[PDB]
Design an enzyme around this catalytic site. Structure first.
Site, PDB file in Angstrom:
ATOM      1  N   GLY A 146      37.800  46.847  45.128  1.00 17.14           N
ATOM      2  CA  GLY A 146      38.557  45.648  45.445  1.00 17.14           C
ATOM      3  C   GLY A 146      37.699  44.693  46.243  1.00 17.14           C
ATOM      4  O   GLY A 146      36.760  45.102  46.909  1.00 17.14           O
ATOM      5  N   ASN A 147      38.014  43.411  46.140  1.00 16.42           N
ATOM      6  CA  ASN A 147      37.243  42.334  46.795  1.00 16.42           C
ATOM      7  C   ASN A 147      38.064  41.066  46.858  1.00 16.42           C
ATOM      8  O   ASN A 147      38.917  40.803  45.977  1.00 16.42           O
ATOM      9  CB  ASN A 147      35.856  42.046  46.099  1.00 16.42           C
TER      10      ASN A 147
ATOM     11  N   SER B 126      29.677  44.074  49.520  1.00 18.32           N
ATOM     12  CA  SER B 126      29.681  45.275  48.681  1.00 18.32           C
ATOM     13  C   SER B 126      29.839  46.602  49.447  1.00 18.32           C
ATOM     14  O   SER B 126      29.208  46.812  50.488  1.00 18.32           O
ATOM     15  CB  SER B 126      28.387  45.354  47.870  1.00 18.32           C
TER      16      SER B 126
ATOM     17  N   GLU C 232      31.299  42.035  42.344  1.00 16.32           N
ATOM     18  CA  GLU C 232      32.066  41.163  41.472  1.00 16.32           C
ATOM     19  C   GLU C 232      32.011  39.670  41.883  1.00 16.32           C
ATOM     20  O   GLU C 232      32.823  38.862  41.414  1.00 16.32           O
ATOM     21  CB  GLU C 232      33.519  41.648  41.387  1.00 16.32           C
TER      22      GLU C 232
ATOM     23  N   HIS D  45      42.310  47.395  42.441  1.00 13.91           N
ATOM     24  CA  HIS D  45      42.707  48.496  41.551  1.00 13.91           C
ATOM     25  C   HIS D  45      44.050  49.044  42.053  1.00 13.91           C
ATOM     26  O   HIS D  45      44.088  49.915  42.941  1.00 13.91           O
ATOM     27  CB  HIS D  45      41.662  49.620  41.537  1.00 13.91           C
TER      28      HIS D  45
END
Ligand code: NI
Ligand code: NI
Ligand code: NI
Ligand code: NI
Ligand SMILES: [Zn+2]
Ligand SMILES: [Zn+2]
Ligand SMILES: [Zn+2]
Ligand SMILES: [Zn+2]
Lengths: 212, 212, 212, 212
Positions: free
Chosen positions: A31-32, A48, A79, A100
């Protein structure tokens, strides 16, 4: 000494990262989050591989429109380009969250779209599309995600997760929540029988009502 | 006075035991954790039948490579040998966690492997195999688990649970989490329709990317 | 001034009542707990209709073997007799917990027994039977529950919930937990395919191992 | 200076709003609560679009029987009229809660009623009906909800959520909880096989017992 992304933006990213975990939308991995500053043309994005509860203000990465990092020592989220390309091609979106989650991801791995069995889907569109598959962190992914999110504020990433975007982090966060909830509803219904999908005309109306 | 497993190792085991409970990966029963110290050739392992929130530093059991306990008064976990035999046959693994989680265990009781409907499975392999059935705490179990975990960092224990191992406790913990999440995804998808399994070539690539 | 159930027993009942809620085994409604004091022949049981987090020491009701209340002002649990009749017909049980949990109750409403797809079922038997239906709080229920719990430490109450009993509250509590977990496992497996049920001989062995 | 809804009513609404979130019955969106004061003929109702944890005492809106707001600056819940019309047509209901819960909403989107596979449904009726579909916040919705809740303390709102009402907020809250739990039970059972529905005569009896 005022040219780069501000303290509170970095703070906002750290807060919503936590809140993804604190509400168990997601555990944290892959996730980000990012924001775009349109006057400055700078994206601040989460680093990251750093646990959401261990991210410091100095871990947030600042990047120009072509991906040149201008602030921060950490590698940006793998991402970063899935985020950046949305800000490059669309002006209605200033904050994006990747996650996610559970049932959205379930639809993602079936490669099935989310239709309007529940009206609240309207925070994103009449339906949520599923992007074509591509390896995490690659250019094909970002491109696949930009295309399948066209006309929406959310898209499913095949065998992977969810991407959503809105005018700010609060609104981006609510769209994940709400889209995860609708996907949950839709999967469970489909265990029982035939979920009833609201028609396009009603969803059109729904869009208008949500504007207010 | 430096020949046995250190304070912080025992501390690490107690912390990750809690964290299994605090994140509701597992309730506590039949689960167990160990570390191997390769220079010393000593395994420290959680005690038998003690609630994860009642384990003291003096409850952790230290054992040599042939199962001779060298430190601690408590009986070691009934699964001490399922752990020890992995350290005897493999050098890429220095920390193992056993757990009765939800959806992994569901696959375990169907005696079904976990394929790559979600890419994050790569933290363990292209798939997770299911060991052949054997009674908890016995030599057949440990042997069945060593064999079916060959080439992976995780294996399902038929009608029982999950076993995972990595270079340390942090990484072992994340592999359980991640494998439980993937099993969850895979079961739910299979309620809806046909989960799409990523091919071996892509999973091969995934392995390479995860190395970095 | 030593003839009635002790402070700590009443305290134990209040603690485990909470813990049913704190672990979300159950929300609180229609659930009840009791202990039997075999030397005294007194049952202490939770009061009727009082939220588990609002039960005081003075709310616990003490009763003799024929249901004559001897201590407390509150009405005893509407299921006092489902508890009492187990203490009247069986000497291996000194603490009972009733609960409306999730997946056990799901099996209860299908009127389906829980077989040994997971070995931990052995804390109660080779399987958990489902009692014949009867209206909550009635003599038929208690009788139906005593009969179908014969040879076990747990039984499912058709369209209702679960009843379990053991030598103390700690052990009664773990049996609910463990039986709810096994029912959960079994239902989920049955969504996917055919759960593999361990044979009677293995379950027999399991019983012996659990004794130690 | 005693003519309008009291401090404690406003306080009660804020408390139960939180408790919907704190027990994860609902996340917060599209949910709303009200009380009717029958002597005063005033409804106090939660405001529109305000997070349950950010609602102040001054945010609660007070309204007369024809929808004329008499206290408060905030827009009332978009569903004010779905609430008000129940108070206009029924005297057995003094507190209502709307919520988008999980499994009730799942039944709502299938447009399937909840039958009496679990006896606790009796807190609302022998079954919960599903209202005919109408756009949130409109007169058709409120009318559809009043009609399909006739003879019950709960109704499902097609593709939307749940509405329940009782003599006070405590009781309204328990009816949501209990109806969500029964819907959960019923859906899960239906994954496994044929849930057994208790007959009308037994449900009739159940109603009588619950009166006491
Ligand atoms: Ni500057
Ligand atoms: Ni030493
Ligand atoms: Ni006495
Ligand atoms: Ni006044
Ligand atoms: Zn991702
Ligand atoms: Zn085990
Ligand atoms: Zn009950
Ligand atoms: Zn609503």
């Amino acid at each position: 000494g005022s040219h780069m992304a501000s303290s509170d933006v970095k703070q906002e990213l750290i807060k919503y990262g936590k809140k993804l975990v604190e509400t168990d939308l997601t555990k944290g991995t892959g996730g980000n989050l990012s924001v775009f500053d349109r006057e400055k043309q700078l994206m601040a994005i989460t680093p990251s591989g750093i646990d959401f509860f261990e991210i410091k203000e100095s871990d947030i990465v600042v990047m120009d429109i072509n991906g040149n990092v201008v602030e921060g020592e950490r590698l940006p989220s793998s991402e970063w380009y899935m985020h950046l390309i949305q800000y490059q091609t669309r002006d209605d979106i200033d904050a994006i969250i990747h996650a996610h989650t559970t049932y959205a991801t379930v639809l993602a791995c079936l490669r099935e779209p989310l239709p309007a069995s529940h009206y609240m889907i309207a925070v994103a569109g009449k339906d949520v599309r599923v992007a074509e598959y591509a390896t995490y962190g690659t250019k094909e992914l970002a491109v696949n995600a930009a295309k399948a999110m066209e006309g929406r504020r959310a898209v499913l990433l095949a065998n992977h997760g969810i991407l959503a975007g809105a005018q700010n982090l609060l609104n981006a966060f609510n769209i994940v929540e709400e889209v995860e909830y609708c996907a949950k509803i839709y999967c469970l219904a489909k265990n029982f029988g035939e979920p009833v999908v609201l028609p396009d005309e009603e969803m059109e109306l729904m869009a208008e009502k949500f504007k207010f």
